[PDB]
Write a protein that binds this ligand. Structure first.
Ligand SMILES: [Cl-]
Ligand SMILES: [Cl-]
Ligand SMILES: [Cl-]
Ligand SMILES: [Cl-]
Ligand SMILES: [Cl-]
Ligand SMILES: [Cl-]
Lengths: 435, 435
C-alpha cells in the first residue's frame, strides 16, 4: 500500500532536488561572472573598480541577510543542524519559507564571493523539497514524513558535488542516531540519490570536480606520517569548533538581534570578501578554485601560513554571522593548505621516502572534516569522489582515525550536533514567555 | 581505563588477522601449484594424470571434511552465519577448535580446486582470532567481548581481498542489526582494518586484485539497462538461495549425519572438482582466474550458458555439502558470466549506444551479491576495490537497487541470516534431549 507510494515519491524528490542543486550551482556561477563583467567598465582605474566591487558584493549580502532575518531565521548558517533536528522531530520544516530564502539568499551570499559553500544550502533545500512533495501529495504516516526528509537531504548532497556513494553514507554514517533504518527507508534513499545524480550528469561533464591530476600512490614505509597528520588535525578540530561558536556569540554583541544592524554588518562582511576576491584571491571565495593551485605546490611555505591565518578569519566571519551558506567547502581549503604545508616539510625531512606534498593535501581535506564534523567515512568518500584519487583510500582512513581519536580525547564534539544543541537550548530558555 | 585497552587490542587483532589471511592465501596458492607440479610426472599419459588428479583432490577434501565433522562442526560452510550469530550472543566462538580446523580444512578444500572462496574462511578466522586475544589477555566486559569479535571479522574481510573501505562497510551496513555502534567500538573496527590491510600490502603488490584493465565509463542514455539487469538478478537471487538450502537438505539424505559417509561424499565432490580443473577449467575453482577471461569477451554466447549451468551445479554441490569454504567468490563468477551474456545482447540490440559487455560483467558481480546476501553497498564497494573501476559507481548502485527491490518483493531473505535461522531452529529442536 503506502510502501510503494514512498519508493515512487523518492524518485520525484530525487529529480526535483537534482534540478534545484544544478539551478543553485549555475545561478551562483552566473552572478560571479556578471560581477567580473560589470567591472570591465573600470578596466584601468583600479581604485573605482575595487569600490564598486565592494558595494556590489555588499548589496547581494544585505539582500541575503535580509531574507533570512525577515522571512526564515532557520535558513541562516549551514542547514545541516536544522535537517538533523527535523530527522529527530525536534525542528520544523517550513519549506514555504526556507526554499525561497535559502535559494535566493544563498545566490546573493555565495554569488558575492563570500567564504561559504553549497553543501549546507542544497542539503537543507533537498530536505525541504522532500517535505514539500509529502505535503503536496498529502502522504500520511510518521514513516513517510521521516523517510522523504532523509532521501531529500542525501539527494541534495549527491547532486551538489556529483557524489552518490557519499549521499548514501551521509544517512547511514553521519545521521546514524537520527535515521530510522528500515528495508523501505534505505531503498528510498538510494532512489533519491540515483535520480539527483542523473540530474547533475545531464548538465555537467562527468569528471574530477576538483581537477588535481593523478597523484602518486602512498608506499608502506610512508603510511605512518598520515597518522601524525591526523593527530595534528585531531587537536586543531575542536579548537576551530570552539572559535565558530565563540564567533557567533561575539558577532551577536555587534547587532544585538536587531534586523537593521544585522543586515549592515552582513554588507561589510559581504563587501570585504568581494574586495578580497580582487586584491588577494586565495583569502576569499568558497575555496574550490584555490585547492588545485595549492595542491600543485605553487605557494611558498610562508604564503601557505598567510592564506591559513587569513582564511580562518574570513571563514569564521562569514559563517558565524549567520549568512545562508555552509562551512564544508571553506574547511576543505583550510585542510588542503595545512596538509600541503605538512607535505612540504615531510618531503625535505625524508628525501629517502619518495614523497609528494599533494597526497597530504588530499588527506588534509578528509582530516579537518573528521576532526570537526566527526563523520569520517562520509568526508573521506566525498573527497575521493571530487578528486578521483581512489589509490589514497588507506592513507585517508589512517588520517581520519588519527583525527577522530584526538578530537574525542581533547573534548571536541560534532560541529553540527553542537549548533543544534545550542538552537534547542535557546528555544527551551525562551519559554520564559510561559513565566 | 578499559576503552584504551580495547583500541590497543584492536591493533594486535588487526595485525594477527592480517598475517593469518596472508598465510591462508599463500598456503592455498602453494598447494594448487604443488598439484600441477606432481602431475608433470604423467605429462603425456592423460588417463593416469586425470586419475591421480582425482585421488589427490579427494584426499585433501576428505582431510578437510574430516577435521570439520570430528573437531568443529560449526567450521563447515561459510563462517559468516556463525560470526553473525556470535555478534548477537546466540552462538559460541570455540577458537581452540575453529582456528586450526578452518585454516587446515580450508587449505585442503580450496587447495584441491573445489568451488569455494576465502571470504567466509578468513572472516570467521579473524573473528575467532579477535576472541582468542580477548581470552588470552583476560579482558572483562560485554563491550570488549563484542567489540573485538567485530574488529576481527572486518579485519579478516579487508586482509582477504585488499578492501579496507569494504571491511568497515561489512560492520556498519551488513552487520547493522547485530553491531553495538559506540564511539570506541567503531574506532576499534578502523584500527583492526588499517593493521590487517598493511599486513596484506607487505606481502602483495598493491594493484587491481581482479586485473580487468580500464573499461569505458557508462553514458547517461545507457544507465536504464543496469536497472533491467538488477531486476533480472532480483528474481534470480531468492531462487539460488532456495537451491542452496534445498541442496543442504538433499545432500544430508546421502550420509544421514554419519561421519564416514559424509567424508567419502566430500572426497567424490573434491575429486570431481580436481578432475574438472583439467578437462574444463571454467566449470571449477573458486572463480577468480575465469572472471577476467569472461569480462574480456573470449567466450561465445553458447559457452557462457554452459559455464553458468555447470557452475550453479558445482557451486551448490561444494557449498551445500558443508565443506569449509565460502560462496562469495563462486557468486562473483556466476554474476560475471550472466552479466557478460546480458552485456553481449545489449551491444547487438543497441548499436547506437556505444556499449561494452565488460561494464555489465562488473555490475553483475554486485547484482548477485545484492540479490542473495542483501548487503548491497558492501558488495558494490568490494567489487570496486578488487577491479579498481571507480567510474562504474553509479551503474552499480542502480543495479544493486534493482536487485534489492525485486529480491524483497519476490520473498527472498539474506542468505547468511537464513542459514543462521536454520542453525538456531535446529538447536532449539534438539532440546528434545530435555524430554
Ligand atoms: Cl548552522
Ligand atoms: Cl558548504
Ligand atoms: Cl555546511
Ligand atoms: Cl554457512
Ligand atoms: Cl568466499
Ligand atoms: Cl561466504
Amino acid at each position: 500500500k503506502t510502501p510503494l507510494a514512498i519508493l515512487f515519491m523518492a524518485a520525484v524528490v530525487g529529480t526535483l532536488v537534482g534540478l534545484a542543486a544544478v539551478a543553485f550551482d549555475k545561478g551562483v556561477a552566473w552572478l560571479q561572472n556578471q560581477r567580473m563583467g560589470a567591472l570591465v567598465h573600470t578596466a584601468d582605474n583600479y581604485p573605482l573598480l575595487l569600490t564598486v566591487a565592494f558595494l556590489c558584493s555588499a548589496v547581494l549580502a544585505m539582500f541575503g541577510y535580509f531574507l533570512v532575518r525577515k522571512y526564515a531565521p532557520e535558513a541562516g548558517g549551514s542547514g545541516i543542524p536544522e535537517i538533523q533536528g527535523a530527522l529527530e522531530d525536534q525542528r520544523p520544516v517550513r519549506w514555504w519559507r526556507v526554499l525561497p530564502v535559502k535559494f535566493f539568499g544563498g545566490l546573493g551570499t555565495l554569488g558575492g564571493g563570500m567564504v561559504l559553500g553549497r553543501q549546507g544550502p542544497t542539503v537543507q533545500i533537498g530536505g525541504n523539497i522532500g517535505r514539500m512533495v509529502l505535503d503536496i501529495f498529502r502522504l500520511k504516516g510518521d514513516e513517510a514524513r521521516h523517510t522523504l526528509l532523509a532521501t531529500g537531504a542525501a539527494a541534495g548532497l549527491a547532486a551538489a558535488f556529483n557524489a552518490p556513494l557519499a549521499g548514501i553514507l551521509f544517512i547511514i554514517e553521519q545521521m546514524r542516531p537520527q535515521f530510522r533504518y528500515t528495508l523501505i527507508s534505505i531503498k528510498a534513499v538510494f532512489i533519491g540519490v540515483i535520480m539527483s545524480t542523473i540530474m547533475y550528469r545531464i548538465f555537467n561533464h562527468e569528471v574530477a570536480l576538483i581537477d588535481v591530476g593523478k597523484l602518486s600512490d602512498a608506499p608502506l614505509n610512508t603510511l605512518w606520517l598520515y597518522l601524525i597528520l591526523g593527530i595534528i588535525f585531531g587537536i586543531f578540530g575542536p579548537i576551530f569548533n570552539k572559535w565558530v561558536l565563540g564567533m557567533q556569540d561575539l558577532l551577536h554583541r555587534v547587532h544585538g538581534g536587531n534586523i537593521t544592524k544585522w543586515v549592515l554588518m552582513g554588507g561589510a562582511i559581504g563587501g570585504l570578501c568581494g574586495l578580497l576576491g580582487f586584491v588577494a584571491p586565495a583569502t576569499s571565495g568558497g575555496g574550490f578554485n584555490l585547492i588545485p593551485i595549492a595542491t600543485a605546490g605553487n605557494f611558498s611555505m610562508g604564503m601557505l601560513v598567510f592564506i591559513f591565518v587569513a582564511r580562518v578569519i574570513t571563514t569564521l566571519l562569514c559563517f558565524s554571522s549567520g549568512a545562508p551558506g555552509g562551512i564544508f567547502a571553506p574547511m576543505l581549503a583550510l585542510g588542503t593548505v595545512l596538509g600541503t604545508a605538512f607535505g612540504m616539510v615531510a618531503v625535505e625531512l625524508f628525501p629517502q621516502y619518495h614523497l609528494e606534498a599533494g597526497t597530504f593535501a588530499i588527506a588534509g581535506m578528509g582530516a579537518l572534516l573528521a576532526a570537526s564534523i566527526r563523520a569520517p567515512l562520509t568526508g573521506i568518500i566525498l573527497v575521493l569522489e571530487m578528486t578521483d584519487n581512489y589509490q589514497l583510500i588507506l592513507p585517508m582512513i589512517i588520517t581520519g582515525l588519527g583525527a577522530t581519536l584526538l578530537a574525542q580525547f581533547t573534548g571536541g564534539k560534532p560541529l553540527y550536533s553542537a549548533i543544534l544543541a545550542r538552537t534547542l537550548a535557546k528555544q527551551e530558555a525562551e519559554q520564559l514567555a510561559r513565566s
